[PDB]
Design a protein around this ligand. Structure first.
Ligand SMILES: NC[C@H]1O[C@H](O[C@H]2[C@H](O)[C@@H](O[C@H]3O[C@H](CO)[C@@H](O)[C@H](N)[C@H]3O)[C@H](N)C[C@@H]2N)[C@H](N)[C@@H](O)[C@@H]1O
Ligand SMILES: [Mg+2]
Ligand SMILES: [Mg+2]
Length: 268
């Protein structure tokens, strides 16, 4: 029988979500199983669980990010440059590959959306505007990004059937780790500025693997390795949300662990 909003809220409370919390979810809807009203049921449950003073932050990206089409070039290729849509935060759909729940989050009334087209973050709650801006090119997951502010805001990572590789906040640890050999990428995104499309080319840390040994397309990357080690070494509330094995992780603690993990393994 499909899970109801009330059942999910009670499960979230059992896992340790409290009114007023700042939560970043990573969801496998397949693991959760059927929901009374589809994915919206779990969105509504998350909002109820954090309450009217709580906040949700999600990494939603953009269905049409021209990442692969511009990667490695000093400017967008001519055909891309002429016809790609500018990123419009009000209308651009979320990227399906990071979870189908994210499009429901981003379209929720009052949701705010960050300006970085590839790293776009959506937030719901009283602190949403403060969470989502600034989000500049060159600051995808590191200092000055919404992730940085999430980590300063008592953030909790709510993994609902998701694997250790899903922990986006660990890209902050990669950004700040004092290690040699860090990989960077160059790409271009089409922004809206005063109603006009402006292409911006930037470099940033490689979010597909901070060192060569973490950058195999299949993984495992550093996020996955760090998170697997952390979860083997730390008390973390675990329990069901819907049909999904779930965990509620202190974000600052896992990111600090990840910085240490990288710096212990890689020369400065
Ligand atoms: N590397 C191994 C990991 O790979 C993917 O996760 C990555 C994404 O690939 C990356 O995406 C970027 O590169 C994509 C491919 O070019 C673009 O499509 C996308 N627009 C662009 O933002 C995110 N920023 C960070 C995330 N950890 C898998 N989901 C994950 O399970 C696996 O562990
Ligand atoms: Mg508050
Ligand atoms: Mg809207």
């Amino acid at each position: 029988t499909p899970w109801s909003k009330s059942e999910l809220v009670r499960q979230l409370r059992d896992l340790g979500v409290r009114s007023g919390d700042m939560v970043m979810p990573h969801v496998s809807l397949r693991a959760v199983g059927p929901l009374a009203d589809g994915p919206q049921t779990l969105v509504d449950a998350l909002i109820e669980a954090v309450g009217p003073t709580g906040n949700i932050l999600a990494f939603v990206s953009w269905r049409d990010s021209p990442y692969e089409q511009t990667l490695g070039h000093d400017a967008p290729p001519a055909a891309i440059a002429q016809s790609w849509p500018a990123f419009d935060p009000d209308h651009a759909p979320a990227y399906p590959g990071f979870g189908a729940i994210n499009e429901f989050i981003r379209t929720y009334p009052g949701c705010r959306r960050s300006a970085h087209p590839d790293a776009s973050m959506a937030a719901i709650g009283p602190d949403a505007a403060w969470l989502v801006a600034p989000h500049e090119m060159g600051a995808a997951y590191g200092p000055r990004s919404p992730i940085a502010r999430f980590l300063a805001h008592a953030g909790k990572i709510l993994s609902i059937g998701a694997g250790p590789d899903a922990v986006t906040a660990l890209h902050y640890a990669e950004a700040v780790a004092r290690i040699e050999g860090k990989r960077r990428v160059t790409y271009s995104m089409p922004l809206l500025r005063e109603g006009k499309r402006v292409w911006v080319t930037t470099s940033d840390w490689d979010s597909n693997g901070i060192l060569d040994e973490y950058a195999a397309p299949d993984g495992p990357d550093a996020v996955e390795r760090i998170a697997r080690d952390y979860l083997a070494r730390t008390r973390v509330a675990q329990g069901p949300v819907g049909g999904a094995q779930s965990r509620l992780i202190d974000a600052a603690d896992i990111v600090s662990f990840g910085i240490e993990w990288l710096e212990a393994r890689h020369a400065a």
